[PDB]
Design a binder for this molecule. Structure first.
Ligand SMILES: *[C@@H]1O[C@H](CO)[C@@H](O[C@@H]2O[C@H](CO)[C@@H](O[C@@H]3O[C@H](CO)[C@@H](O)[C@H](O)[C@H]3NC(C)=O)[C@H](O)[C@H]2NC(C)=O)[C@H](O)[C@H]1NC(C)=O
Ligand SMILES: COc1ccc(NC(=S)NCCCn2ccnc2)cc1OC
Ligand SMILES: [Zn+2]
Length: 322
């Protein structure tokens, strides 16, 4: 059964040369200027910035050569402030492909009462993760473009409404991912399949969150995807050894497995709940700047994001056999 393929899917390793290509092909400063900065705005759901951010994300995807099919899953859901609109953004290569590797972030920024001139823009949470996805799509565009010709491709999801409006709780969090997981569960896939839905199609949900601080460490949360966590470790290591990372030794590997991490609630939960395999790339411990105004551009550490861009881009190419 094809739904079972994700369970045996193996990455196709890049050699030294293809790794050097990947490291050369991403530009942190182009991500910064073109993908990240336009997201460094207040963009809690329903805010002006939410729309700008959504448009930006979609523009950035659409300008690429790969044949990304962009959809916005817009819906209203009750929050502590009443019903609010949310729009997940889903960008899919080869929407007909039974399987997709899914990379995800949340693109909303947490609402805080506007009490002074500053606004919370959640640079790590998760503008950088989103900008990373965009950068990945761009850096890998030519290879990903070639997927037009395993029935497996790539999807990006930018969840809206990850953040609680008032106080984090299962009623007040994950609005976009709860909604979308539910939607994909009621979405047979491939179309006119009887018993399979888009969730079945999710080979792996790699959810990036809280990235952009110096010296992140990403726990390995799930036995199910430990082999993929291991691939990140291997990639970090080989990139390190090829002198393709910057300002980063393996003294404090990003990908440190100190045993199965205690699960952190985030947009993967509604998917994990349905048995979607998850790789949850959230920094833990959280950045000192977490949910403060200083989670901002200034406190971002570019080399770290650039390293992780290389690592993730390799992961993705290898997953996709590109
Ligand atoms: C690291 O891996 C690289 C990528 O896999 C190797 O380079 C690859 O070598 C293949 C043959 O040795 C190429 O096959 C060719 O593919 C192109 C399209 O990409 C076609 O036009 C050609 O017809 C085809 N050749 C034949 C005889 O049919 C791979 O495309 C090529 N890949 C890339 C990205 O250049 C590197 O050599 C390898 N490095 C080391 C040190 O092993
Ligand atoms: C490992 O166990 C943890 C459990 C709970 C928390 N605290 C919170 S609130 N978790 C939800 C975070 C949701 N999120 C993501 C981005 N913005 C908000 C921290 C943890 O370890 C560091
Ligand atoms: Zn947050």
């Amino acid at each position: 059964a094809w739904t079972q393929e994700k369970n045996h899917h193996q990455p196709a390793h890049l050699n030294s040369s293809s790794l050097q290509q990947v490291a050369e092909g991403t530009s942190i400063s182009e991500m910064w200027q073109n993908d990240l900065r336009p997201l460094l705005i207040e963009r809690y759901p329903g805010s002006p910035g939410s729309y700008s951010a959504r448009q930006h994300i979609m523009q950035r995807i659409q300008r690429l050569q790969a044949e990304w099919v962009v959809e916005v899953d817009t819906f209203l859901s009750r929050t502590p402030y009443g019903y609010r609109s949310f729009s997940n953004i889903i960008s899919t290569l080869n929407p007909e492909a039974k399987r997709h590797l899914v990379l995800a972030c949340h693109y909303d920024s947490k609402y805080f009462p506007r009490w002074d001139s500053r606004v919370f823009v959640g640079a790590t949470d998760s503008a950088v993760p989103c900008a990373m996805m965009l950068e990945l799509a761009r850096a890998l565009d030519k290879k990903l473009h070639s997927l037009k010709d395993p029935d497996l491709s790539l999807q990006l999801i930018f969840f809206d409404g990850e953040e609680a409006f008032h106080h984090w709780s299962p009623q007040d969090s994950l609005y976009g991912s709860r909604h979308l997981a539910q939607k994909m569960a009621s979405s047979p896939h491939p179309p006119g399949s009887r018993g399979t839905n888009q969730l079945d199609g999710m080979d792996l949900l790699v959810l990036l969150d809280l990235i952009g601080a110096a010296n992140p460490t990403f726990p390995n949360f799930f036995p199910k995807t430990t082999r993929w966590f291991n691939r990140l470790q291997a990639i970090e290591k080989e990139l390190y050894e090829l002198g393709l990372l910057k300002d980063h030794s393996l003294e404090r590997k990003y990908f440190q497995n100190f045993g199965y991490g205690n699960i952190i609630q985030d947009d993967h939960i509604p998917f994990l709940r349905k048995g979607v395999p998850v790789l949850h790339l959230i920094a833990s411990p959280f950045p000192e700047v977490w949910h403060t105004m200083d989670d901002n551009e200034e406190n971002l550490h570019a080399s770290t994001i650039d390293n992780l861009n290389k690592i993730i881009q390799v992961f993705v190419l290898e997953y996709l056999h590109l």
